[PDB]
């Protein structure tokens, strides 16, 4: 099957890229190794930057996001037993913190793609990349895991297949440089059936560790506890999880944490990762296939959306005028934004998490930063602007 | 000899405290173990916070600071071969980065104190503190090192005697908690007979290490190079110093580093240190006797001035109304400001210095932070407000 751009992965990066290309008359074929049900059924976060909201609306796929999304005026930084509100709406001159679950974004983009004649193969298996260093790259795969071996002949391959996809290894080790940080802690995330304890997100730093109170709906809440990076979910009974959440979220004015059944519990590791370059011949990486951020800053899906806007612009210049300049500089342009988001995500992570390797001096300056950011208008404005994207 | 407040040390802390107390009719006696010539020859601080400039003017001792000090509208962060201006004057609503050397501040305060009947003993020896946990603390010392043993009977002792003075050990180890950070680098500081290369301070991050271009006068410049903490001045010839300064300060638009005789060179170590509490009975610490910051943020002299403003207010409430509240909370009030300045000094230090222990990712985030603080109005404003001093309590 011949196309212009072969896309590996139907996450936010692959789906947004395929639709941006469609809006400019450029054809694509997406392959996805999981089922449509699986990709549409995640409990992944939905904190969207203003740029991602603008992009969804610009693309004509933002109607359900605007109708069903939750628009908050701010969020809270809790530390030393006190909550401190960051009024994003006041500090940014009218913007909101937007939440619209990643699975909802995926559902909207899959539906828009299928409705506009888009080609998406779900449940593919045995995926491989070939001749990426030529003008005729190829993608090979088997439909429905064990179908006959099929080939996509294309001009470009977009590697939108996440951290463990096959596209990043297709950039030879001798050409790439990787940057990484392993945080000395992980998150224990829980999906709970209970009303929300507060109207806005709560990012809490406590002597015992970090806690994050988020939401999905009026009935379903999403909460996280910082845990030691080696910890297993079998070390954390429901009783221990709720006791630790109550301890870390405690306030002098008496906060009431609403508890319920934990439908899901799991440990997720926290990492920073940057691959440079994000291209090799006709292969171009975007999103988690090229870089990872710790989720404290909620930048991952937003960076995937920024990467594909640059890639689509380069592809458009190639098909319209035969120009290669923007494609040649795709890595250069994307990395400028990536490094700033990596810095912010690292800043939020280190400011809010307990580090047991920290000296008492380091813990003192961590608490001093928390005091400063919540008592300075410029520091709070900078946090607000970084949080909703810039 | 009886007095109200016995002060150990004639640095910025002790001198500012003695004069603030004089302005409120409170007597003091200062003892200083170095000569007046030695303390007036001090080479270190150059930059004053806006609050310290306001304090010197408020106290009636700011005339020479205004006439001879240098008032800059901003400073530069140089990285990736390009200079980025932080317009402090614009971002702070009218404040300046003030360059007026620590030794000039000391000269002005010693003169003002002596002119107003102040008692200062220079070149003292054999100094000791006694009965600090009583209502009658005492300071013992020998004038001119070989004098007869003298005693100062006072109501309070102010420990303004610097990092290695005798006052901090007088707070028992069982009552205090110390916080510290060790840095792998030091500063090689030089004094050069040359004109200024630029109108404003230059803080440069380079692959080879940090460099700072500061000034003293139109004819004397003060420059610093980051060096390994175990380096000695004999490892650094004048040729090696200039070659390293030219390399680290290089810009794509071609910066001209103005050279001349390097008449002073020395290596100075750096650290972060906080002692909590800063008081024990009638003994109260202030300045470097209580806390140290690495010099990248130009906070140390400024923090000593902030500490003594709080201490003077407490002492004033005690003598005027017999109230102990402000004195009881002196450590609490001072520490809130100290911790924020400790964070900022650590932030400036770690963003600008080369650390060979950094992973490639940590080097990337360091350069991203330099890009961020120079590309956001709110981030540059936050940087500027911290640089010229956060609001006083
Ligand atoms: C706890 C947590 C919370 C987060 N919260 C937020 C947040 O609020 N805001 C935010 O912006 N980001 C957030 N993120 C990050 C965000 O979810 C990711 O950065 C984002 O999913 C990356 O999108 P992507 O399209 O690059 O990759 P992915 O979402 O991983 O999509 C890649 C797709 O490729 C498919 N694929 C894999 N291998 C193959 C193959 N062989 N063949 C075909 N297809 C294949 C996968 O099945 C997958 O569907 C969070 C992450 C975590 C862990
Ligand atoms: C390279 C460098 C650059 C700096 N630049 C700046 C800057 O630009 N801005 C800034 O704000 N700060 C700066 N600082 C910090 C600043 O110099 C100090 O924080 C400041 O000197 C502290 O003043 P102090 O009065 O607390 O102590 P000190 O200045 O140390 O004075 C204490 C005094 O006590 C005396 N003393 C000691 N023992 C005894 C004893 N037994 N009896 C009697 N007297 C005794 C000493 O002789 C001394 O005169 C810098 C420091 C360095 C190293």
């Amino acid at each position: 099957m011949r196309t212009q751009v072969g896309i590996i992965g139907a996450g936010p990066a692959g789906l947004l890229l395929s639709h941006l290309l469609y809006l400019q008359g450029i054809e694509s074929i997406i392959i996805e190794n999981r089922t449509r049900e699986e990709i549409e059924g995640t409990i992944r976060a939905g904190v969207l930057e203003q740029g991602t909201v603008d992009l969804m609306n610009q693309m004509g796929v933002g109607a359900r996001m605007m109708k069903e999304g939750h628009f908050h005026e701010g969020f809270e930084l809790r530390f030393n037993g006190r909550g401190h509100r960051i009024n994003v709406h006041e500090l940014t001159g009218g913007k909101y913190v937007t939440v619209y679950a990643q699975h909802e974004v995926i559902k909207d983009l899959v539906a828009a793609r299928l409705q506009t004649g888009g080609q998406i193969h779900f449940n593919v298996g045995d995926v491989s990349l070939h001749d990426v260093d030529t003008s005729s790259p190829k993608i090979r795969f088997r439909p429905n895991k064990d179908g006959e071996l099929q080939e996509i002949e294309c001009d470009f391959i977009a590697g939108c297949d996440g951290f463990r996809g096959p596209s990043r290894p297709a950039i030879p080790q001798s050409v790439r440089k990787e940057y990484q940080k392993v945080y000395p802690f992980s998150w224990l995330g829980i999906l709970v059936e209970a009303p929300p304890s507060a109207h806005e997100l709560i990012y809490a730093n406590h002597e015992r560790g970090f806690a994050l109170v988020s939401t999905r709906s009026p009935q379903i809440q999403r909460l996280y506890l910082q845990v030691d990076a080696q910890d297993h979910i079998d070390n954390w009974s429901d009783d221990r999880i709720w006791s630790e959440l109550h301890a870390r979220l405690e306030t002098r004015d008496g906060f009431k944490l609403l508890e319920g059944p934990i439908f899901q519990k799991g440990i997720v590791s926290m990492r920073s990762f940057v691959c440079d370059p994000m291209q090799h011949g006709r292969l171009f990486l975007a999103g988690d296939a090229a870089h990872i951020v710790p989720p404290t800053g909620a930048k991952g899906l937003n960076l995937a959306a920024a990467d594909v806007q640059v890639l689509a612009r380069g592809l458009e210049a190639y098909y319209k005028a035969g120009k290669m300049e923007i494609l040649n500089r795709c890595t250069e342009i994307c990395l400028r934004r990536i490094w700033k988001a990596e810095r912010f995500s690292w800043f939020m992570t280190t400011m809010l998490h307990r580090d047991q390797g920290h000296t008492p001096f380091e813990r003192g300056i961590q608490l001093a930063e928390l005091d400063y950011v919540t008592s300075s208008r410029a520091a709070s404005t900078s946090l607000a602007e970084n949080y909703i994207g810039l």
Side-chain angles (χ1 to χ4, degrees), chain A:
Chain A
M1 42 179 60
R2 183 165 185 274
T3 195
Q4 285 171 290
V5 183
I7 301 175
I8 309 175
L15 289 169
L16 285 165
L17 175 65
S18 188
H19 208 72
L20 284 164
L21 294 175
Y22 158 73
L23 294 169
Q24 306 294 321
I26 297 162
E27 299 189 2
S28 70
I29 295 173
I30 304 173
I31 61 162
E32 167 56 64
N33 63 341
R34 295 186 293 150
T35 65
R36 181 176 183 180
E37 168 92 341
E38 285 178 292
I39 77 170
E40 295 183 354
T42 173
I43 55 171
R44 189 58 54 91
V47 180
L48 303 180
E49 281 188 340
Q50 187 62 51
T52 305
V53 169
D54 292 347
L55 177 66
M56 294 281 288
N57 288 324
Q58 169 204 103
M59 294 170 61
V61 300
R64 198 166 68 96
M65 172 189 72
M66 301 290 296
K67 288 166 191 179
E68 301 186 3
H70 308 294
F71 300 86
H72 298 169
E73 293 192 22
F75 65 88
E76 181 175 296
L77 292 181
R78 179 172 301 186
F79 64 95
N80 285 333
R82 189 182 305 171
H84 299 265
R85 187 160 184 253
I86 299 301
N87 191 338
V88 171
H89 178 275
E90 198 271 330
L91 302 161
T92 60
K95 316 306 223 256
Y96 290 90
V97 294
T98 301
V99 166
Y100 185 58
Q102 177 164 326
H103 77 266
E104 303 282 24
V105 171
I106 292 165
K107 284 168 68 192
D108 298 344
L109 298 172
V110 167
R113 289 277 52 231
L114 297 180
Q115 187 55 56
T116 54
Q119 258 242 292
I120 310 175
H121 301 270
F122 294 101
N123 204 32
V124 165
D126 198 18
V127 181
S128 68
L129 289 77
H130 304 269
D131 305 328
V132 312
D133 213 26
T134 75
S135 58
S136 62
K138 303 155 187 74
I139 301 171
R140 294 178 198 142
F141 71 99
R142 302 182 178 274
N144 283 300
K145 297 293 181 200
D146 57 10
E148 209 69 5
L149 195 63
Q150 282 185 22
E151 189 182 81
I152 295 170
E153 296 84 27
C154 54
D155 307 321
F156 302 92
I157 295 172
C160 302
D161 50 9
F163 190 58
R164 299 211 158 83
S167 301
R168 187 174 70 256
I171 301 184
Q173 263 172 326
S174 62
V175 155
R176 54 186 225 265
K177 277 197 185 70
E178 296 177 344
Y179 302 82
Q180 70 273 325
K181 179 169 279 276
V182 184
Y183 294 89
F185 39 73
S186 289
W187 279 3
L188 186 160
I190 64 172
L191 194 74
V192 177
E193 193 175 62
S197 304
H199 288 100
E200 305 179 334
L201 290 187
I202 298 164
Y203 285 88
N205 170 302
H206 189 272
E207 171 52 41
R208 301 187 57 93
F210 168 81
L212 168 54
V213 185
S214 191
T215 186
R216 287 295 181 271
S217 69
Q219 168 195 2
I220 302 297
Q221 314 310 317
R222 181 72 173 150
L223 293 89
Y224 303 94
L225 273 178
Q226 162 187 352
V227 297
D228 287 352
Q230 83 295 345
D231 273 22
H232 266 166
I233 204 55
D234 65 7
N235 303 138
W236 289 86
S237 66
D238 288 356
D239 288 18
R240 189 186 176 193
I241 293 167
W242 283 122
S243 291
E244 199 58 40
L245 280 164
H246 278 86
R248 297 176 194 191
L249 295 163
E250 194 195 1
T251 62
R252 306 177 211 179
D253 67 1
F255 172 74
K256 297 258 196 203
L257 176 64
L258 302 172
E259 68 209 358
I262 292 172
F263 286 155
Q264 184 266 350
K265 53 173 167 196
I267 292 182
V268 52
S269 67
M270 306 263 298
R271 86 167 70 210
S272 280
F273 174 87
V274 174
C275 175
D276 181 359
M278 297 162 59
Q279 68 202 83
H280 177 250
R282 296 293 186 90
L283 169 64
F284 285 81
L285 304 186
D288 282 12
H291 45 74
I292 304 288
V293 285
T296 327
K299 296 292 154 227
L301 177 149
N302 300 297
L303 269 184
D307 286 350
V308 300
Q309 286 175 256
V310 173
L311 176 54
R313 278 179 281 209
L315 291 168
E316 286 148 24
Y318 175 79
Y319 289 119
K320 179 188 174 48
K323 299 187 194 177
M324 215 68 195
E325 186 184 319
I326 306 172
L327 282 172
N328 284 350
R329 306 166 72 246
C330 187
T331 293
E332 175 188 341
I333 302 170
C334 291
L335 282 177
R336 267 131 53 181
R337 186 173 186 90
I338 289 158
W339 278 114
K340 279 183 246 186
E342 287 285 345
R343 199 281 314 177
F344 179 66
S345 301
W346 170 84
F347 170 78
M348 288 281 284
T349 300
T350 65
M351 180 171 64
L352 296 161
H353 293 74
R354 188 251 264 271
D355 184 333
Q356 255 313 113
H358 269 173
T359 62
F361 174 82
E362 287 166 337
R363 171 58 172 168
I365 60 166
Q366 180 182 56
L367 286 166
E369 182 59 359
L370 278 169
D371 181 19
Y372 178 62
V373 166
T374 63
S375 63
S376 163
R377 183 164 180 91
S380 288
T381 298
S382 172
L383 173 62
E385 295 182 336
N386 269 116
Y387 194 77
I388 53 66
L390 219 66

